[PDB]
Design a protein around this ligand. Structure first.
Ligand SMILES: CCOc1cc(CC(=O)N[C@@H](CC(C)C)c2ccccc2N2CCCCC2)ccc1C(=O)O
Ligand SMILES: Nc1ncnc2c1ncn2[C@@H]1O[C@H](COP(=O)(O)OP(=O)(O)OP(=O)(O)O)[C@@H](O)[C@H]1O
Ligand SMILES: Nc1ncnc2c1ncn2[C@@H]1O[C@H](COP(=O)(O)OP(=O)(O)OP(=O)(O)O)[C@@H](O)[C@H]1O
Ligand SMILES: [Mg+2]
Ligand SMILES: [Mg+2]
Length: 1189
């Protein structure tokens, strides 16, 4: 008997109840979820799919055939279940038919009720079994496809001809969209055959029950599918347009957030906010058409059935000598309700099928793509697939266990030489011998995972504290490591703590040196290394650390230095080897080349600067079940009480009119001329259509209004927020507040809310109507209501947890595919292919199990609610037949009871989804409630002179500065009197609050004690906007936002182009802009990458000049600037700003030695404030010490 109960559980999902029930006590952890059965592990599915694919290739290969060969049987089983389920589900109307017309005891009207109950249960259990089988096969297919494309990625080539700039984009698209769409098509595949059969059977049954008259209604409903497909295509068009505008808006917002401090300093936040508001306006303009089409689709879906009913019944009434019977009428109405959904969804199935065909074509295109004495090579010719040997006559030899160096000119091919020796490119002729063992490789372009530093260093190697410390010290990486927030175990790479090129390549070199292997390749590890660091790495790392290990080291470096240490040297030229040998060998054979090295060698602070920027970033650092009804009400009200009332009233009236239509039909059928009834029915149907249209339009209007209001208010509040907000909160979350949350509010909330309200109203109306026909039904209803409440609670909590876990598991998979897509050369050099493949299998298995359990929970909820609906139908039917009432009311009760089962689960599912989305709404609403700054100014703007800062007098009175309240004041008792028309120099030990002093000048940081006085007006006693408007500033790293040169010079557009030209001339940038096309109107890319760093500084100086601040502040402007550019900067500061007041945060003292006066800072203390010449001649203080060095 055990098999019977086992199958029952596998059908009623009894295994899901323990996880779902426990969902309350503990969040659904990955461990809590049992691992995938070996029958469903991604590895096995990949094996089967590869077998099928190779069988196809044995006879150009097509994926579709392989997918069939792999997963046909589950699909056939699913189709069998689906066909049986639909065939049984056609029993509903037939049973209603026979019960209303109430040894062939089937007419007894009692046995038929239990027959209907059992048939409904069997139908729905089979249908859910089919859903689950197709879900499982689809997820298996997704796992197999991901594994297959991952293997392809691992075997991909790196030729620039093949792997273009868009190759990584294509791979991300495949993993994120194409595979998912193919999975969805696999989910929906059974429908593609179960829908047309269902529709045909429905039409045949309609003809049998109601005769040729029902043909009109059949045609009217069949017209639903083309309409749905057309409006769906238009909707997709509008959605693409909205996606384009949304991407533009997101780019603008992201650039704004990054460097927000700069915008606040320039006081330009308002103009950027206005531009983003314009972008949002266009986005909303497109979203309005999207909403129009969505509303049209909903209206058609909810009205075409009414039109079909109207046409059918009017035609039958006017074209039948026999008056309309009740049983036939209600059976036909139930059949229409059965057929509406399949027709409404066949169009979506077709769209998914087309998208899947496109996706499979794209995946096939991807797959059919190109792919690939320690060492000696003889007669080696290699190319990058161009057909022309990029390397020729490769007679290289790599002596075992000895340092080897490769020298050459720019773009000689040494990097290509290493790649070819790795076998990473086609070998036209010649062979390479290994005497393959894995080789430690540090790519010319450094590469890093998204794991922490420890993972990068180990890279899967067993941890050894001794080796880790030794290599870290050898590469001088310990300090910068300590600078990190968590030191080690600190995420780095694209998503983690951003690192400069020097640090990245140092980490890569550390990885290479740590990894235990006999062969090490270092491709110019000194790309951005200072002399001291490079020398330390060479002496301690390259030689000693590997001398002990007796490794074989091949080094590629432009810097001819250190060649003395190298045992063997290689000379290359134009993708060919001039000579190979030691220094003595080259000297003997090629004197000219030997001397040429000395000739070039004889004709010969970034690291410290880099760490300073890194250290600056480090300065800053029960019942999870109840939905947020407060937040949902806040959202609903956001649109406006008028719109909310209109929506509610319209929907209530629509459902009242629909139930009125049904009751009118019942009363009409009561009898057993018809003009009165038909006229009434027609007017009712017209009113219903009108109300459907009105309610759809109203819900969409409410959605649009709410989205616009919420987004606008959020952007205003965030932009008007204090700097600390962005300093603490990671930029990622703030950006996500507009990336996803806004997308959800725009697109998901309105449709989901409309569906939830419609389902709730339909369920309530059905219950009320069956009670009206069957007053005794409520007694049986109440326990069912209790069960419904419990199911609602459990499923809502479980689904929330499962969905969140699914997303958290998915994100690492995309991250890993993106990472492995890059650095393929590095992985293949380490030959860690197996490790990464296993990692991918683990990640995909976890994601698949999460998704599968989410779908299984959905199935469990469906089965429970469906047994509930079956009990409802049984009780309603039995009570009605037993109860004495008019036949029409009996038919109405049976019809509504049968229907209620379709919506009884949609109500709860939409409720859960709306809860999840209200989560995001709460996120946004809470985020926009953050307190703003004291923009109000105590003094009247008129009282403060318009040209207030012209004089340039500044005083400091015992100032104290604190970044945040309750923290130690970085500045204390800071007093300073800066004479107008004076130059002020500031220098001291790093971290002495110089930039803090500048921020205090700009009010950015709180002035807890003391004051800053300019022109006799306290800075605090003034609007911060006014202060920032008429003050200049030159940050250390200038940033320019995407747009024209005019926009950067003056977003306010207040000054004439003559002023801009004069500013660019004085800033020495007039010729630079003139040479570039477009002149003043030339475009600029985001972040100022279009121009050189010195040009960015010139742009900043031009901004200062045009601002006419009368003041000037420089925060180590010369830092990270070319010496000639630094001299130009000094000249322009000295001459152009002669009449202005200059305050400089001197990165280097000698640049500010000429300042009229200097200030010495130390731990928030003004140790010295005099002329720099006097301080040097007075005492040998701190200023004298660092300035002398
Ligand atoms: C994650 C998707 O897992 C499922 C997968 C399925 C498989 C399936 O034949 N769908 C039919 C719906 C049935 C009732 C007609 C369908 C067809 C076309 C468009 C959408 C849809 N449906 C898509 C989801 C359910 C609502 C409309 C069912 C149900 C689920 C589910 O999660 O409940
Ligand atoms: N992966 C690649 N695919 C295609 N062509 C490549 C690839 N790598 C290099 N090349 C081309 O091969 C030639 C030499 O490139 P390579 O990087 O090997 O030279 P190099 O002397 O090491 O240069 P570098 O100054 O960048 O260190 C150039 O034409 C370069 O464009
Ligand atoms: N964002 C911040 N939040 C809180 N405290 C900060 C922040 N930035 C700096 N501090 C504190 O202020 C001290 C000095 O700040 P600041 O960067 O202005 O000084 P500095 O001497 O000009 O430094 P730098 O070397 O960057 O020019 C830091 O040591 C830290 O104590
Ligand atoms: Mg190179
Ligand atoms: Mg500073």
């Amino acid at each position: 008997l055990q098999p019977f109960v086992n199958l029952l559980s596998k059908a009623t999902y009894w295994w899901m109840n323990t996880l779902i029930i426990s969902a309350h006590r503990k969040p659904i952890d990955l461990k809590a979820i049992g691992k995938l059965p070996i029958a469903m592990r991604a590895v096995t599915n990949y094996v089967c799919l590869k077998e099928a694919y190779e069988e196809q290739k044995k006879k150009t290969p097509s994926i579709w055939l392989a997918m069939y060969r792999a997963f046909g049987r589950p699909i056939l089983l699913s189709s069998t279940f689906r066909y049986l389920a639909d065939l049984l589900g056609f029993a509903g109307p037939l049973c209603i038919s026979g019960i209303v017309q109430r040894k062939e005891f089937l007419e007894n009207a009692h046995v038929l009720a239990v027959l209907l109950f059992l048939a409904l249960i069997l139908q729905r259990t089979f249908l859910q079994a089919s859903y689950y089988v197709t879900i499982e096969t689809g997820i298996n297919l997704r796992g197999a496809l991901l594994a297959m494309i991952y293997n392809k990625i691992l075997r991909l080539s790196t030729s620039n001809l093949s792997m273009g700039e868009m190759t990584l984009g294509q791979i991300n698209n495949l993993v994120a969209i194409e595979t998912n769409q193919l999975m969805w098509f696999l989910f929906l595949c059974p429908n593609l055959w179960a829908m047309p059969v269902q529709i045909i059977m429905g039409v045949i049954l309609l003809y049998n029950l109601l005769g040729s008259s029902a043909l009109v209604g059949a045609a009217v409903i069949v017209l639903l599918a083309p309409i749905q497909y057309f409006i769906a295509t238009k909707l997709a068009e509008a959605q693409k347009s909205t996606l384009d505008y949304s991407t533009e808006r997101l780019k603008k917002t992201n650039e704004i957030l990054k460097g927000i401090k700069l915008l606040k300093l320039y006081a330009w936040e308002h103009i950027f906010c206005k531009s983003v508001e314009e972008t949002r306006m266009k986005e909303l303009s497109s979203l309005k058409t999207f909403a129009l089409y969505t509303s049209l689709s909903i209206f058609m879906n909810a009205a075409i059935p009414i039109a079909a009913v109207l046409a059918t019944f009017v035609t039958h009434a006017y074209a039948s000598g026999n008056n309309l019977k009740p049983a036939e009428a209600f059976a036909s109405l139930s059949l229409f309700h059965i057929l509406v959904t399949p027709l409404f969804l066949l169009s979506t199935v077709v769209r998914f099928a087309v998208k899947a065909i496109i996706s499979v074509q794209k995946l096939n295109e991807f797959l059919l793509s190109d792919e690939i004495v320690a060492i000696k090579v003889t007669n080696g010719y290699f190319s990058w697939g161009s057909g022309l040997a990029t390397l020729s006559n490769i007679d290289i030899r790599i002596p075992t266990g000895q340092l080897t160096m490769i020298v050459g000119q720019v773009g000689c091919g040494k990097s290509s030489l290493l790649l070819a020796i790795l076998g990473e490119m086609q070998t036209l002729e010649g062979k390479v011998y290994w005497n393959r063992y894995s080789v430690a490789y540090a790519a010319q372009k450094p590469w890093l995972l998204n794991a922490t530093v420890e993972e990068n260093i180990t890279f899967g190697s067993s941890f050894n504290r001794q080796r880790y410390k030794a290599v870290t010290d050898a590469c001088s990486l310990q300090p910068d490591i300590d600078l990190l927030p968590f030191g080690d175990q600190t995420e780095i790479g694209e998503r983690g703590i951003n690192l400069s090129g020097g640090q990245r390549q140092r980490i890569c070199v550390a990885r290479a040196l740590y990894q235990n292997t006999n062969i090490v390749f270092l491709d110019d590890p000194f790309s951005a290394l200072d002399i001291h660091l490079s020398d330390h790495l060479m002496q301690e790392g390259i030689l000693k650390f590997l001398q002990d290990d007796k490794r074989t080291v091949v080094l590629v470096t432009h810097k001819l230095q250190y060649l003395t240490h190298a045992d063997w040297i290689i000379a290359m030229k134009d993708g060919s080897v001039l000579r190979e040998g030691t220094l003595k060998d080259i000297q003997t054979k090629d004197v000219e080349l030997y001397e040429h090295w000395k000739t070039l060698m004889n004709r010969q602070d970034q690291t410290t600067l880099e760490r300073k920027t890194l250290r600056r970033a480090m300065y800053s650092r029960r019942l999870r079940t109840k939905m947020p009804w407060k937040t949902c009400w806040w959202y609903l009200t956001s649109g406006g009480f008028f719109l909310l009332f209109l929506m509610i009233f319209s929907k209530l009236l629509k459902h009242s009119v629909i139930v009125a239509i049904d009751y009118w039909l019942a009363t009409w059928t009561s009898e057993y001329d018809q003009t009165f009834y038909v006229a009434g029915f027609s007017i009712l149907c017209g009113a219903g259509i009108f109300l459907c249209l009105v309610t759809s339009l109203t819900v969409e209007w409410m959605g649009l209004t709410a989205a616009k209001n919420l987004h606008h208010n959020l952007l205003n509040k965030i932009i008007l927020g204090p700097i600390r907000f962005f300093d603490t909160t990671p930029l990622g979350l703030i950006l996500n507040r507009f990336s996803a949350d806004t997308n959800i509010i725009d697109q998901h909330i309105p449709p989901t809310l409309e569906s939830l309200t419609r389902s709730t109203l339909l369920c309530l109306s059905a219950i009320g109507m069956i009670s009206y026909a069957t007053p005794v039904f409520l007694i049986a209803l109440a326990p069912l209501g209790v069960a419904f409440y419990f199911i609602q609670k459990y499923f809502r909590v479980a689904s929330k947890d499962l969905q969140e876990l699914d997303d958290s598991t998915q994100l690492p998979l995309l991250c890993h595919f993106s990472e492995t897509a890059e650095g393929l050369t590095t992985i293949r050099a380490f030959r860690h292919e197996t490790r990464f493949k296993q990692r991918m299998l683990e990640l995909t298995d976890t994601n698949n199990i999460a998704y599968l359990f989410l779908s299984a929970a959905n199935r469990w909820l469906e089965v429970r609610t469906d047994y509930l609906g079956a009990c409802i139908v049984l009780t309603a039917s039995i009570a009605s037949i037993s109860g004495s009432s008019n036949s029409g009311l009996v038919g109405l009760g049976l019809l509504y009871a049968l229907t209620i089962t379709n919506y009884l689960n949609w109500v709860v599912r939409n409720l859960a989804d709306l809860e999840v989305q209200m989560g995001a709404v709460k996120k946004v609403n809470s985020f926009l409630t953050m307190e703003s700054e004291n923009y109000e100014g105590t003094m009247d703007p008129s009282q403060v002179p318009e040209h207030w800062p012209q004089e340039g007098e500044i005083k400091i009175h015992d100032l104290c500065v604190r970044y945040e309240n309750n923290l130690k004041p970085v500045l204390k008792h800071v007093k300073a009197y800066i004479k107008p028309g004076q130059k002020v120099g500031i220098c001291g030990r790093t971290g002495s609050g110089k930039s803090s002093l500048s921020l205090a000048f700009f009010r950015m940081v709180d002035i807890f004690d003391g004051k800053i006085v300019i022109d006799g007006i306290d800075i605090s006693k003034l609007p911060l906007h006014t202060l920032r408007s008429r003050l200049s500033i030159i940050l250390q790293d200038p940033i320019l936002f995407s747009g024209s040169i005019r926009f950067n010079l003056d977003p306010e557009c207040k000054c004439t182009d003559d002023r801009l030209w004069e500013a660019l001339e004085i800033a020495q940038l007039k010729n630079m802009v003139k040479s570039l096309p477009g002149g003043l109107d030339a475009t600029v890319t985001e972040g100022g990458e279009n121009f050189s760093v010195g040009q960015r500084q010139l742009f900043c100086l031009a901004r200062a000049f045009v601002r006419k601040s009368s003041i000037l502040i420089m925060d180590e402007a010369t830092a990270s600037i070319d010496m000639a550019t630094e001299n130009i900067l000094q000249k322009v500061v000295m001459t152009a700003f002669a009449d202005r007041t200059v305050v400089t945060i001197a990165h280097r003292v000698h640049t500010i030695l000429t300042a009229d006066l200097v200030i010495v800072m130390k731990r928030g203390n003004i140790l010295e404030y005099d002329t720099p010449e006097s301080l040097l001649a007075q005492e040998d203080g701190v200023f004298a010490s660092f300035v002398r060095a």
